[PDB]
Structure formats: structure tokens, C-alpha cells
Ligand binder design. Structure first.
Ligand SMILES: Nc1ncnc2c1ncn2[C@@H]1O[C@H](COP(=O)(O)OP(=O)(O)O)[C@@H](O)[C@H]1O
Ligand SMILES: Nc1ncnc2c1ncn2[C@@H]1O[C@H](COP(=O)(O)OP(=O)(O)O)[C@@H](O)[C@H]1O
Ligand SMILES: O=P([O-])([O-])O
Ligand SMILES: O=P([O-])([O-])O
Ligand code: NA
Ligand code: NA
Lengths: 230, 232
């Protein structure tokens, strides 16, 4: 479902060359639940961004759902992201002037597949907020009126909106207390097992990572090791 | 060193009045290390913001280092903040077009009354970054050129920059791996114990909270309970 082939991502600063990812190889099958761990700065977000088609590798190839994404133009890339990927951003990246509900509806507007009526769209957005454990009474808050953890749940709900086959979550429980975070992880487990979604979670919480079938560890931009869990 | 007396903070959302905090009473002694925990949305940030003079209660009194703050103006509160408080924001609140080093120099220079040399600006700021466990090679990166956890360490360093008597930290390890986070907490312990700094940390990590001598639990905007981690 996801393949990274000899992927490198470099940054140039002055005369210094930085390898955020260095010749990485990764193969995530359809319906797999995979967790990604490693020290702050090891390249975890870079990797997720590349999988999520939000950044392009400097060298290497990327395949999403059997589609080579490298040489695609932004129109095709936008389409692939919207169709294939639900992305939970580490810092949420909500639209400040839209309510929580509106933020979740936004992807449904541009699904570019089939049109929903307004009622159908609002109904789906609400279902996603409920799945993401956000109380309906917060649906009309704007992001600046929500706590960090409430915002995180809006970001989670938005990722689920278009019912994508692939969920990419960057530290999706960081702003949540243990109990609420556990509910989120049980949801990902359910979507993975019952709905066959491919799930990739970056995390610093070993307890979170343990929901995955395996844990991939990065270190200084390279895959250090993998631990099989099941 | 910090007192909240019958502090309430409300927000009006339509015809409904929401209580972020409700009739809370809190006394934090000089040099105490206190942790605050509680469910997402229970009022922790609001509490820390009020302690940090970043927001005012709707009702009640706040005292910082003996000074009553709840009736001060924006200008006046800023002067107290700059002198007495180092604040680590939950989402960092760094300045985008400044390097990590420059971000750290801001509060240093805003508080410092005199004229600090360009070379010594860099010197103190680098020392803050090192305490915050960020490698020197990242000093010249801008926030958008850093990972989340690297940004968090810049935010931590910035809180250190004014050598404040009070450090207030909102989930200061969330973006960090366990080992790096442990170092940050060890740093807080050292500042608290060796230098007598008053430290208040909001956290969802019980291991983090245990660095405190007390844990205050919030629920629905009120103090649910208190746990004393040292004898009395
Ligand atoms: N735009 C950039 N320019 C230079 N270096 C960058 C840039 N973006 C990220 N990096 C660096 O790449 C590394 C990996 O970051 P990621 O955000 O990829 O790390 P992680 O998610 O594991 O914490 C970091 O050391 C970071 O400083
Ligand atoms: N500007 C605001 N307008 C309306 N409600 C707010 C606003 N800011 C915070 N709140 C609400 O106050 C409550 C507590 O906020 P917060 O202090 O951020 O909780 P915590 O830090 O424990 O997650 C939340 O329910 C939140 O939605
Ligand atoms: O604030 P929070 O939601 O708890 O993170
Ligand atoms: O630093 P980080 O990215 O959070 O790991
Ligand atoms: Na990350
Ligand atoms: Na908060």
C-alpha cells in the first residue's frame, strides 16, 4: 500500500548539507498498522510528510496505493492526497476562521469524487467529531476557542472525513490525557481491523506504538531497526 | 510566591456562560515544584496563563511575589511577566522569521535593563539552548526548519533566558522522546533545588508530574484533588 524506495531528503544550509532522511527503504502493506518511533529530529515527520505527499524526496521513489507519486503535478498530487490519505498534523493546522465542524466539512467539499448535499456533509462531519471523541457542544467553537487536545481531536476528525484508505497520524495523542488518548487508539485499531485501513502512527509514547503490528525506529535519518509485535 | 484566591475565568459562547476555572484557590510557595494534571479541557492552560500574567481572572485575586496582579493593566502585567516569569507555551509560540538563537535572545534583551553586547547576547542565548538540550548546530535554524521537539527545546530555552524566579511550563516534554524529556525534567529539578526557582508544570505524563512535590488535579474547571509527594 505504501513503498519508499531509496528515499533521501536533504536540506542545504550555507555550505552545510543536512540529511533528514538518508537512503530509506520502507514497505507498508495494505491494512497494516505500523508505528514509527525515534529521537526528536530523527526524521519521523519528514518520512510521514513524504508518505503523505506533502513533501517530495530529494532522491528516490514513492508509491501510494500502487501509484508512483514522484513525477506527478500538483493537481494530480492534490487529488491523490484527498482520495487516498487522511493526515493528522502534529500541530493540527486548523483554519482559524472556520469552526471545528466547518474545518471537518472542508475536505468533504473537495473530495472530487461524488457530491454530498449540505445535510449529508454536516452529518458526516459530526460523525467524525464523535469518532474523534469531541463533544458535540464544541462543534461550533473556532480553533482559538478550543484547548490543545480539543483541537487535536478536530484534526483527527478532519483526517477521517473523506474515509480515506490510508491514515497518517503524527503524534495523534500528544495533547490528550491517557484515557482520551486510549479511546483514539482504540478507534484506529477498529478502523484498521474492521475497515481494513492502512494506519501509520508517529509517536513518542511506547504505549501508543504498541497498537501497531510493528514499530519502525529511526535514528539520524535512517531506519535503525524494526520490532515485530504480533 | 503565587496565590489564586477565589479565581474564576468564564467565556460567553452564545447565551451560555462557560467556566474555564471556577472558584479555585491555590497557594504555591516560593521554590516549590508543583505539577498540574487533568483531562483535556479541564482548565490547566487557563490556570497557568493566569499565574503567568498572560490572562486575568473574570473574578478573584491573583498575587505574584506578593504583588497583586489581577487589577494591573496590560503594560503593567508585561513588566511583571518580563521580570518574574519564564513561560513554556504548549504550542511554543516562536517567532517565525527569527533563528532559534534569536528567538531566545528576545526575552533576555527585553528584561535586561542595560545595553548588552552582540557577542554576549549570543553567549547567554547559546547557554540557554544547551541547558534545553538542543545541539548548537541548530541555533541558526528558523522554527520552520526545526522538528517539533527541537522547537519545544527552543521554547524551553526562551523561558530560561530572563533567569526568572518562576518557570511555568505547559506540557514541556510532549514533543520529546523519553530520554530527552528526562533531561529536561532533570534540568527543572536542578533549577528548583539548586537555584530556588518556583516551578509549575502542566502535564499528561505521570512520570513528569512526579518530579513535583505536589500534584494538583483539575476537573471541569475546579480543583478535584491534591496529591502530596513529600511528607507533611
Ligand atoms: N526546512 C529544513 N531545513 C533544514 N533542516 C530541516 C528542515 N526541516 C527539517 N529539518 C531537519 O530535519 C530533521 C528531521 O526532522 P523531522 O521533523 O524530520 O524529525 P522528527 O520528526 O523525527 O522529530 C531535523 O533535525 C530538522 O532539524
Ligand atoms: N477563548 C475561549 N472561548 C471560549 N472557550 C474557551 C476559550 N478558551 C478556552 N476555552 C475553554 O475553556 C476550557 C479550558 O481551557 P484550557 O485551559 O485550555 O483547558 P486545558 O488546558 O486543561 O486543556 C475548555 O473547555 C476550552 O474550550
Ligand atoms: O489542553 P489539553 O487539551 O489537555 O492538551
Ligand atoms: O521532535 P519530534 O519531531 O516531536 O520528535
Ligand atoms: Na514529529
Ligand atoms: Na492546554
Amino acid at each position: 500500500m505504501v513503498k519508499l524506495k531509496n528515499v533521501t531528503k536533504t536540506y542545504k544550509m550555507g555550505e552545510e548539507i543536512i540529511y533528514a532522511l538518508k537512503n530509506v527503504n520502507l514497505n507498508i502493506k495494505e491494512g497494516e498498522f505500523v508505528s514509527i518511533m525515534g529521537p526528536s529530529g530523527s526524521g519521523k515527520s519528514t518520512m510521514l510528510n513524504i508518505i503523505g505527499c506533502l513533501d517530495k524526496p530529494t532522491e528516490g521513489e514513492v508509491y501510494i496505493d500502487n501509484i508512483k507519486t514522484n513525477d506527478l503535478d500538483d493537481d494530480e498530487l492534490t487529488k491523490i492526497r484527498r482520495d487516498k490519505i487522511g493526515f493528522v498534523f502534529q500541530q493540527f493546522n486548523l483554519i482559524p476562521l472556520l469552526t471545528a465542524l466547518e474545518n471537518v466539512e472542508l475536505p468533504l467539499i473537495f473530495k472530487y469524487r461524488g457530491a454530498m448535499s449540505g445535510e449529508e456533509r454536516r452529518k458526516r462531519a459530526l460523525e467524525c467529531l464523535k469518532m474523534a471523541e469531541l463533544e458535540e457542544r464544541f462543534a461550533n467553537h473556532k480553533p482559538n476557542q478550543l484547548s490543545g487536545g480539543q483541537q487535536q481531536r478536530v484534526a483527527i476528525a478532519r483526517a477521517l472525513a473523506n474515509n480515506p484508505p490510508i491514515i497518517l497520524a503524527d503524534q495523534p495523542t500528544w495533547a490528550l490525557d491517557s484515557k482520551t488518548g486510549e479511546k483514539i487508539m482504540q478507534l484506529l485499531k477498529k478502523l484498521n481491523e474492521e475497515d481494513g485501513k492502512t494506519v501509520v502512527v508517529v509517536t513518542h509514547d511506547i504505549n501508543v506504538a504498541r497498537f501497531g503490528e510493528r514499530i519502525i525506529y529511526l535514528k539520524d535519518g535512517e531506519v535503525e531497526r524494526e520490532e515485530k509485535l504480533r
